[PDB]
Coordinates of C-alpha atoms in Angstrom, one line a residue:
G1 CA 0.1 0.0 -0.1
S2 CA 1.7 2.6 -1.2
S3 CA 2.0 5.7 1.5
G4 CA 4.1 8.4 0.8
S5 CA 7.2 9.3 -1.3
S6 CA 7.0 7.0 -3.8
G7 CA 9.3 6.4 -7.1
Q8 CA 13.2 6.0 -7.1
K9 CA 14.8 8.5 -5.7
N10 CA 18.0 6.4 -5.1
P11 CA 18.3 2.6 -4.1
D12 CA 20.6 3.4 -1.1
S13 CA 23.4 5.8 -1.6
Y14 CA 21.5 9.7 -1.2
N15 CA 22.1 10.6 -5.0
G16 CA 25.5 8.9 -6.9
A17 CA 26.8 5.8 -8.3
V18 CA 26.5 2.6 -7.6
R19 CA 28.7 -0.8 -8.6
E20 CA 29.7 -3.9 -7.6
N21 CA 32.9 -3.1 -5.8
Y22 CA 32.9 0.0 -3.6
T23 CA 29.9 2.5 -3.5
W24 CA 31.2 6.5 -3.2
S25 CA 28.7 9.8 -3.3
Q26 CA 30.0 13.3 -4.1
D27 CA 29.0 16.0 -1.6
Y28 CA 29.9 20.3 -0.8
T29 CA 33.4 19.5 -0.1
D30 CA 33.7 16.4 1.2
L31 CA 33.2 12.5 -0.3
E32 CA 32.0 9.2 1.4
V33 CA 33.1 5.6 0.2
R34 CA 31.6 2.8 1.7
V35 CA 33.0 -0.9 0.8
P36 CA 31.3 -4.1 2.0
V37 CA 33.3 -6.7 4.3
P38 CA 32.5 -9.9 5.0
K39 CA 31.4 -11.4 8.3
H40 CA 35.1 -12.6 8.4
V41 CA 36.1 -9.3 8.6
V42 CA 36.1 -7.0 12.3
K43 CA 39.7 -6.4 12.9
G44 CA 41.0 -3.3 11.1
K45 CA 44.6 -4.9 10.5
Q46 CA 42.4 -7.8 8.1
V47 CA 41.7 -4.2 5.7
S48 CA 44.3 -2.7 4.3
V49 CA 43.9 1.0 3.8
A50 CA 46.7 3.4 2.0
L51 CA 46.1 7.4 2.4
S52 CA 48.6 9.4 0.1
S53 CA 47.1 12.2 -2.0
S54 CA 46.0 11.3 -5.1
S55 CA 45.4 7.0 -4.5
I56 CA 43.2 5.1 -2.3
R57 CA 43.8 1.1 -1.4
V58 CA 41.3 -1.0 -0.1
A59 CA 42.2 -4.9 0.7
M60 CA 40.8 -7.0 2.8
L61 CA 42.3 -10.3 4.1
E62 CA 40.2 -13.4 2.8
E63 CA 41.7 -16.7 4.3
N64 CA 45.0 -18.1 2.8
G65 CA 45.7 -14.4 1.0
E66 CA 43.5 -10.8 0.9
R67 CA 41.6 -9.4 -2.0
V68 CA 41.7 -5.5 -3.4
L69 CA 38.1 -4.5 -2.8
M70 CA 38.6 -1.0 -4.1
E71 CA 42.0 0.8 -5.2
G72 CA 43.2 3.0 -7.7
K73 CA 44.8 6.5 -8.4
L74 CA 42.7 9.6 -7.2
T75 CA 41.0 11.7 -9.4
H76 CA 42.8 14.3 -7.3
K77 CA 44.8 15.4 -3.9
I78 CA 43.3 15.2 -0.8
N79 CA 44.3 16.1 2.5
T80 CA 44.8 13.1 4.2
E81 CA 45.2 14.6 7.6
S82 CA 41.7 15.8 7.5
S83 CA 40.8 12.8 5.9
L84 CA 39.8 9.3 7.8
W85 CA 38.8 6.2 7.2
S86 CA 36.8 3.3 10.3
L87 CA 36.5 -0.2 9.5
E88 CA 33.4 -2.1 10.9
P89 CA 33.0 -5.3 12.4
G90 CA 30.6 -7.4 9.5
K91 CA 29.4 -4.4 8.2
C92 CA 31.7 -1.8 5.5
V93 CA 34.4 -0.2 5.3
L94 CA 33.7 4.3 5.9
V95 CA 36.9 6.8 4.3
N96 CA 36.2 10.0 4.5
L97 CA 37.9 11.9 1.8
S98 CA 38.4 16.1 2.8
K99 CA 38.8 17.9 -0.5
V100 CA 42.3 20.6 -0.5
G101 CA 40.0 23.0 -2.2
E102 CA 36.6 23.5 -4.6
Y103 CA 37.3 20.9 -7.1
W104 CA 34.9 19.1 -8.6
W105 CA 35.1 15.1 -8.2
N106 CA 33.4 13.6 -11.0
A107 CA 34.7 10.3 -9.6
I108 CA 37.0 8.7 -7.1
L109 CA 39.7 6.8 -9.1
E110 CA 41.3 8.4 -12.4
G111 CA 39.4 6.1 -14.7
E112 CA 35.7 5.8 -13.6
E113 CA 32.4 6.8 -15.2
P114 CA 31.6 10.7 -14.3
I115 CA 28.9 11.1 -12.2
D116 CA 25.5 12.2 -13.7
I117 CA 25.2 15.2 -11.6
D118 CA 26.4 18.8 -13.7
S119 CA 26.6 21.9 -13.2
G120 CA 26.1 24.8 -15.8
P121 CA 29.7 26.6 -17.0
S122 CA 32.2 25.3 -15.2
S123 CA 35.7 25.4 -17.6
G124 CA 35.7 29.6 -18.3

């Protein structure tokens, strides 16, 4: 019984892109990427998080090895200092990216489809 806001505004991520690897979204001045983890990942030592500026790394320990959930050179630089990352047991990984100014992050890595959201004139 339809009651209230109905339709299709978003699956889960409040406006953004979705894929089978790692979700992310673009906001005013900050990005939020959530990576799904198994029910065997609780410790942060089971996952690898490399923060530099224009690069990110997201891996998780399986059993006899590990797997790179999300990784690749970022589109631009960030403020690792201001940036953070929190691991959740039997949930997902949280990574906060702090923009180093007013930039339009059309993507996370330098090789990811450009988000839909767009603005008027920018180049000029």
